[PDB]
Design a protein around this nucleic acid. Sequence first.
RNA 1: GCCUGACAGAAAACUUCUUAAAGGGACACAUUUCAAAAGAAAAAGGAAGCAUUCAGCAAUAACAGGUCUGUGAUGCCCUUAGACAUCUUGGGCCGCACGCGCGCUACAAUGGAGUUACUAGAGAGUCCGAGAUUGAAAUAGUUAAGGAAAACUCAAAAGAACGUACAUGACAGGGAUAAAUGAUUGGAAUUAUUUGUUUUGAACGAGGAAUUCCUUGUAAUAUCGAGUCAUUAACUCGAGAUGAAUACGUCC
Lengths: 105, 10, 66, 55, 127, 46, 124, 137, 89, 179
Amino acid sequence: GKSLEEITAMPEADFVKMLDARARRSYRRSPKLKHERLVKKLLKIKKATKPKLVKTHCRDKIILPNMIGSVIGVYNGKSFTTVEIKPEMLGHYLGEFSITYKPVT
Amino acid sequence: VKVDNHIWIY
Amino acid sequence: MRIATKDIIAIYKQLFNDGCIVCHKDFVCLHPVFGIPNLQVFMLMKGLATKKCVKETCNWRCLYWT
Amino acid sequence: GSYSIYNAHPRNYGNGSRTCRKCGARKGLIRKYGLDLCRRCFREKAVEIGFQKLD
Amino acid sequence: MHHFSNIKDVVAIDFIKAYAGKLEIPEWVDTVKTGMCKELAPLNPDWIYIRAAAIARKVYLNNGIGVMALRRAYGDQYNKHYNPSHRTLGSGKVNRYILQQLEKMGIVAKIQSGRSLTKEGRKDMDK
Amino acid sequence: ITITSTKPVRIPTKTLRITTRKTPCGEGSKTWDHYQMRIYKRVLSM
Amino acid sequence: VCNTNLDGRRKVPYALTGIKGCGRRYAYLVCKRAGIDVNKRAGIEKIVDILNNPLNYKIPVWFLNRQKDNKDGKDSQLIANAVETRLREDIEALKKMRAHRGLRHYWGLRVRGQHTKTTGRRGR
Amino acid sequence: VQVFGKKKTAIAVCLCKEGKGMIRVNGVPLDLINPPVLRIKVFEPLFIVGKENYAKLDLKIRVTGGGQVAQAYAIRQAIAKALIAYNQKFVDETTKNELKAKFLEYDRTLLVADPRRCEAKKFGGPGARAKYQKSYR
Amino acid sequence: MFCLTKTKALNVDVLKTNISRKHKFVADGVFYAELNELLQRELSADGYSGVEVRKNGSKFQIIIIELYVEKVLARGLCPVSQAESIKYK
Amino acid sequence: LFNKWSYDVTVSDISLKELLAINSKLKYQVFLPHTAGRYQIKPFRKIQCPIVERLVCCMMQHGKNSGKKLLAMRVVEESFEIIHLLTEKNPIQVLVDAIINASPREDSTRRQAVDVSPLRRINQALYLMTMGCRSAAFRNSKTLAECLADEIVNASKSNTASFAIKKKEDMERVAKSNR
RNA sequence: GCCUGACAGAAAACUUCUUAAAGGGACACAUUUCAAAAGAAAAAGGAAGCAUUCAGCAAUAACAGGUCUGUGAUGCCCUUAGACAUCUUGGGCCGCACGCGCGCUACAAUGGAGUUACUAGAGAGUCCGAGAUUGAAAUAGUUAAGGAAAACUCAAAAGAACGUACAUGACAGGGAUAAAUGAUUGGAAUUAUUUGUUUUGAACGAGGAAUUCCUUGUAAUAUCGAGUCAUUAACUCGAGAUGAAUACGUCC
């Protein structure tokens, strides 16, 4: 919607006000302990450092500016697909960027 | 003859 | 197995006092009376049947000892 | 620990929660009238329960 | 023969049309269809006044009635997909607006069991 | 005084209908045994 | 009328459906707001602006094609030949991030995740 | 004297008494029936024996089942039966006998209910007799 | 510590204070089957040959809370006891 | 038939006079083509049905219109007024003579040319003139009422433009070579 | 008490319709014809005359038919602490170059779309079925008596009536495909659970060889309840709504 420089510093609580209906409803419910244990690692690795690759099965996480530039591995069925978060692939679900099957042959 | 809502026959 | 130290005496008392202890085959819930999972109750005393202390009649997904 | 993670998944909705009273089969539960008796088992005890084959 | 004692001695459709400035027009008279099954808005601009008279008649015959007992009355069938058609409740805001507007006119009331007619309301339609 | 049994104001009976597949598996033709049992209610007032 | 040619035989509410952004329910609203009789046959400058500038012409935001538009702006602005171009930039956006919904669009499969084993039998 | 007309499920309970030739069904005149194509059908007993027989009779008929056509066939039954019962309880039986002969000569169903009723759906088919298609190959 | 919070009750549905009339006979009928198959594996050497669950208004009378035993005079005519004898032999 | 048409009509050929219920008894002059009798429980019980009643029920085919008597009778009731307009005679009379003229007299069996029973003459006559109205009112501006009306008046006297007459002489001509 | 016999709030009795117990009621007897007889056929009466109709049980003997993936029913084999036992996270049985079966919806004017009055039967309800009040465009969000139920909830659509509308036009029949955005159920909706609003507007013009079901409230047409269920029917089990034709026949 608005400019990136005006969207990455404003708190993400007000960011989800204009997000998707599913994305603004999942945020309404209490944060998952597994989701909260991710954001602790995502900011921890960023400050130490191209950010280091982290691995997780939390393909349910809504993309938020707190992981705006991290490197996240996502378990499809057998391995962790490395994705580098970009502003253009926002609150769409974190699992949509990892196929779980061979498409067709 | 008759004029109902289905036909107009005259 | 490694059941609570004090509870082993507690579970034995009910059998001694009454002569019949009833446990369910559902191993995910808790014993309504003892407040402990049904797994421990059957786990400890399934070796009692080897020592011929009780019998091993099972009926309708319930385990019986006498 | 050894059993700290054991059976940690909450099963409250129910397909693997509700079981047959005697058979224990996880499919075809007749929850009507609160029997909680899955088929292939209610048929055996329907006469005992009070159900009879009429028309 | 034919004798008149109440409004059950005339046809329903012609009486409703004959019964159609207190009923002020709301802001959603044009951008609203009379339900959820329907795919087109009402055609005639006077559709409220036909609906307003009809809702009054329903209260007349059925003393204890509610809004949700009017949503089912003015319902239709869901024939928008390949699934077989099933009934579905009509829109609520359009239906309850007339009843609230009829409350101020003194025709209907708010009894403990829904809505009912008043002294002047019964007299007004009979004339 | 109200009495109900599986075998005076005579309340209409509420038959309890339950239908099941005869087979214990999927094989064979589809045959259903229509199981039922009524409930009779009587009311005594004095 | 909005860089489009319409048939002059049908009624006005049912002749405006030829516009790629105006359909059946939308057409009936703009005929009421513009104060033109619905029963009149199609066979004018007041219509081409309410289609493209409907916010100030007594229209609700839930009666809009493009709600919560990106790249600034909150109006529909889709009742034109803008329908195809606006649709395209959404499709190509998903491919750039390699999102799964975009991946299926690239292969031309069933986007909304349906059983394609049996139905959808276009032999290729 | 109270009579009844019967159909599949529709029931037309009447109340025959002296009146002014007025007939109301559930509070509305018989001339204002909902399916107007059956306006003549419910009036068949009136013209069969003449309206002078019904000139001094009042009827209060309630319908509590069936459909739009099941009720219409019950209305004609309760009308014809009511005249028979009134001519039996009070008027001489000779006068009723000639009236019943004309009624039964035209339509037997006017004075007796149809025994036909819906059947019961059975397993392995959509209706009472029809079954599901068989796929040999 | 076990991460188990579910608890399955050791109760019978007939004991409910208020219950639907449709459910009462069904719940009682199910209790008949469970009790009958309870002593099935217990009175195998005894030949239970039947159970009766008559009630005296407030107390449940169990015939083979308390227990009653009646020795059937027609031992031969009972198939349940006879089937045990065939199984024994 | 609807307090408009009388039943003072005759039948041309005696071959159908005893098999058509027109005015023989008092049960056939019926106020509506809506009678809920049991005309198919014993053989030759359908002859006791009124002629227009049988004609009405034949307009209830092709699936989507099954079991809709009220919709079917409306087509007939508003058609017998059209037949009177185009013939100034009794619409019942027009139907009666149309049945006789459109009735086939010889068919073939798998071929051997065989005659047709008088009831099958009536049964096939109705099945013919309704098919023409059903097909000619499909995807057409013209309504079914006139479509049924024009077929009966055309098939009435001698016209070969009607579907019924074409088929009536189609089988006879085929049976003319199947002697 | 209100109104031009209707309606509203307390009452006092009756059982034809309602419910449900018992008995009665048809046995083809009564006539005619046909076959010394078992019996067959018509018409009248009868609420009911094909065993009156539809259903449940349903013998002797057999399949080397399906289920040991229903069980604390089990034989024998096999794995048995790095496991084929058990549990946790994620993925799948939903994947498409195609072929087959059971079905749903359409190819319309006997129709679609817009307004109105309507008419059922049979189920189900303990935190469960949810009346009433409101804000709203709908999905749905806030407060909520009654009901363990002939008590309260649980309510019809096919069809009809109303208009100078639609008029043979892949059109306003058809609603697949998608693009937007809003919530419901769930620890969790992405490979959309379900669903609302606007837009997108495809094949399908009555279907080749073959093949399935059906004889009376039957076929067919459209709908409702329940099973499954935290949420999801185009499936199954049932119920009523309207009510065709053709036969009372033969082994092709």
